Structure formats: structure tokens, C-alpha cells
């Protein structure tokens, strides 16, 4: 189930010699609670198509987040442009404490044991990019030991 | 920087110039000096009482007063409320609290405390403006 989360409504006014438009764009985050997470937007007007074309746009790319279960396996961060996020793994019995673009990809993957020091910008585009571009750069233990050519259980 | 020259010159922090400079100052009356003890409200006495025009395009005449504090600093203090007992020479109490869209005047006048009573005809802002709770 491609779990939806909206960010905002919008209005854009292109002042010309004539008249300005009433485009109502948006941007959403679409995860699945499995470690296969996307996000999407669209220059739309319809609040359904603000979801629908963007849910279609998020289903242009669901990124593969490797999840050693129970939390996010490492103490990680994010990076895009002028913004950057941060995640520290923690206990399960906490209650998730994060924000708007830093909680979004973190809650639609079912992990719930993390931190959030959302550094960088306040523009949610490159923020939720950094929430995604950091998270896509995650790696597990078993594939890297395959990639390095050691064994999996040799790493502790 | 370098951590070498950070020993040679440390990260000295930044100061913060605090608002309301007339409320964190006393007066050594014996030696004509000044103390700094940060009162909530320092009392004073009115010298002039008038009003002022907001230069921002909101339009009113908001009433202010030229008050001299205990430490004899002359201010321009906003007199909130509608009616008052502030003709002249009222020995009043003065808070901080800036009124925006009004240059220079950044102090309130504590209603109903020192020598004024508060305003009368209020029924939604009763705890302020000197009105005791009815019945």
C-alpha cells in the first residue's frame, strides 16, 4: 500500500501584460512501510491530481532503502543542495519526533526508532530531497560483505 | 579556521543588546552613579501627557506620557486603556512592552497600580486596566 502524505497547497501568479494564472501545485511523499520509498509533485490545479499525478510521479521512482529491521541500522544523515537531514537510531518505545519533510520519508517506511536534526534549509523541496538522497545512500551489512567479499557474520 | 590559531585567538561569543534600556538601571542617589538591577517595573512620575500618531498607515491617536523614573531618565511611555487619571504629576508605575508602529515610545504604563486607578468600562479585559473582578 503506497502510503500517502501531502505537504501543501499552492497558488502561482504569472504576472504578464494580461492576467495571472491560478495553478494549484503540490508535492507529496509516497512510501510503503517496507523500505521502498518514493516522493512526487506536479504543476497541477486539481487537489485530486495534486495527489494523483504526484502519486503517479512517485511511482516513477520508488527508491530502495535497505532496512536492517527495528530501526534504521546506522547513525546517518542527508544531503541535497542547501538542505540536509540527520537520523540517529534509538529505542522503539519513544513516539516518533520529527517534522514536515524530515518525518515524511521516515514515517512512510515503518521504522519508528530514529532521530531528526533537520539542518540546512527550510525549503521543503531540497529538504525532502536530502531526506531522500541521504536515505537512498543507505546500505545493509550482508550486501557490503558480499561486495567487499568477506562473509556476513564476520563484521562484528 | 585553524585549531592552531584558535588557541592563538579563541571563539569569543557575541553579545546581545537587550530591549528596554530604562528598566535595567538604578541610581546611586548618594554618589550620583548608576546601579543595574533589572526591575519588572520602576515607578516614576508624569511630566507631560499627550498622544501620538502612528506613522504606519494604521490611523489613531495613541496616548503616551513623558515619565521620569526613579533613576531620573525621561521616557515616552504608552498609556494603555481609554480613560485615565493622568492629567499631570501622577506618581505612576511603568512596565516595559513596546507598542509597535510608533517610533521612540517603547514603554507601557501600568494601569491601576501606583497613583492611577485603571479604566472603568471594561468587561472582557477586566484583570488588566485596574478593574476588580465583579461580585
Amino acid at each position: 500500500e503506497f502510503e500517502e502524505r501531502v505537504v501543501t497547497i499552492n497558488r502561482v501568479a504569472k504576472v504578464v501584460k494580461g492576467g495571472r494564472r491560478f495553478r494549484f501545485t503540490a508535492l507529496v511523499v509516497v512510501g510503503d512501510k517496507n523500505g521502498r520509498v518514493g516522493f512526487g509533485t506536479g504543476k497541477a490545479q486539481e487537489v485530486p491530481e495534486a495527489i494523483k499525478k504526484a502519486v503517479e510521479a512517485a511511482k516513477k521512482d520508488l527508491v530502495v532503502v535497505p532496512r536492517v529491521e527495528g530501526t534504521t541500522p546506522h547513525t546517518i544523515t542527508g544531503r541535497y543542495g542547501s538542505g540536509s537531514v540527520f537520523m540517529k537510531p534509538a529505542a522503539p518505545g519513544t513516539g516518533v519526533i520529527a517534522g514536515g519533510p524530515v518525518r515524511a520519508v521516515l514515517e512512510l517506511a515503518g521504522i519508528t526508532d530514529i532521530l531528526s536534526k533537520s539542518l540546512g534549509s527550510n525549503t521543503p523541496i531540497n529538504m525532502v530531497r536530502a531526506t531522500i538522497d541521504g536515505l537512498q545512500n543507505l546500505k545493509n551489512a550482508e550486501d557490503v560483505a558480499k561486495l567487499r567479499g568477506k562473509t556476513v557474520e564476520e563484521l562484528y | 579556521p585553524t585549531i592552531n590559531q584558535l588557541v592563538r585567538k579563541p571563539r569569543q561569543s557575541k553579545i546581545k543588546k537587550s530591549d528596554s534600556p530604562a528598566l535595567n538601571k538604578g541610581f546611586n542617589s548618594k554618589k550620583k552613579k548608576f546601579t543595574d538591577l533589572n526591575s519588572p517595573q520602576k515607578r516614576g512620575v508624569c511630566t507631560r501627557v499627550g498622544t501620538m500618531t502612528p506613522k504606519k498607515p494604521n490611523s489613531a491617536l495613541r496616548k503616551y506620557a513623558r515619565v521620569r523614573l526613579s533613576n531620573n531618565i525621561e521616557i515616552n511611555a504608552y498609556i494603555p486603556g481609554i480613560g485615565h487619571n493622568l492629567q499631570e504629576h501622577s506618581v505612576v508605575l511603568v512596565r516595559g512592552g513596546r507598542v509597535k508602529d510608533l517610533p521612540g515610545v517603547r514603554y507601557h504604563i501600568v494601569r491601576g497600580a501606583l497613583d492611577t486607578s485603571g479604566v472603568d468600562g471594561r468587561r472582557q479585559g477586566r484583570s488588566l486596566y485596574g478593574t476588580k473582578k465583579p461580585k
Partner: protein
């Protein structure tokens, strides 16, 4: 007039790791060859090879990757420098990427690694958080 040998040597690896190289080398010392041994002791590369030349001969790297045209060496950074020589305690020594990297340890016990100093009960001069 370079000051950190083990960092410019380490960033030259990442200098060609970006453009997907499979073969580079580095100069030698008493340390830096044996430092390059601890990489291929874990075996992150195919094999680091022999020192040949007159003074600090080139010892190869042979960068070993994944089958999806990938790279294994994510993150390459010496932490110490001339001006800041940093050390580690064995009792609160961390894990690089929470158990997905390595962190080597340098003292007069022989230049050891994260596994080779957690059960050695010595710390030392830590260098690389390479994951």
C-alpha cells in the same frame, strides 16, 4: 611540503574511485605499505601489491567492486593531521556506520584495527572511518 601522507594517499584513492578505476598504486614506507595491508587483510580491494622502485616504490591497489558496476569503498577520511593528533579509548570505541565500517588503531602494539583492538584492550591513534 605536504604534511599528511596517509590522507593525500587516501584521497587519491577516492580521486580515482569517483571515475571508476580498477588499478592504482601509492608510495611506500615502513607504515604505509603495512597500512595498505590492513585494507587487503579485510580484503576491500582485489589485492594490494608489491613495492618495487628505489625510494617509496609503487604498491598497487586493484580496486574491487560489486557486480552492479558499483564501488565498495564509501567514505575515505583520515581524522588525524599535523596539528591535530587524535586518540581513542578502548572502552568507548564506536563502530563505523554502527557496525558497517572499520576503524584502525595505531600504537606500539603493531598498527591494529577495530576488531584487533576491541579484544586487545588497547586504544591508540585512530585514522580512518571507512565504510
Amino acid at each position: 611540503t605536504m604534511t599528511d601522507p596517509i590522507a593525500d594517499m587516501l584521497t587519491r584513492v577516492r580521486n580515482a574511485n569517483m571515475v571508476r578505476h580498477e588499478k592504482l598504486e601509492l608510495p611506500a614506507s615502513n607504515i604505509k605499505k603495512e597500512i595498505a595491508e590492513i585494507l587487503k587483510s579485510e580484503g576491500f580491494i582485489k589485492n594490494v601489491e608489491y613495492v618495487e622502485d628505489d625510494k617509496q616504490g609503487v604498491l598497487r591497489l586493484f580496486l574491487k567492486y560489486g557486480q552492479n558496476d558499483e564501488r565498495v569503498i564509501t567514505g575515505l577520511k583520515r581524522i588525524s593531521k599535523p596539528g591535530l593528533r587524535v586518540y581513542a579509548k578502548a572502552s568507548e570505541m564506536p563502530k563505523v556506520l554502527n557496525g558497517l565500517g572499520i576503524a584502525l588503531v595505531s600504537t606500539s602494539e603493531g598498527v591494529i584495527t577495530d576488531k584487533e583492538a576491541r579484544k586487545r584492550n588497547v586504544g591508540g591513534e585512530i585514522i580512518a572511518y571507512v565504510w
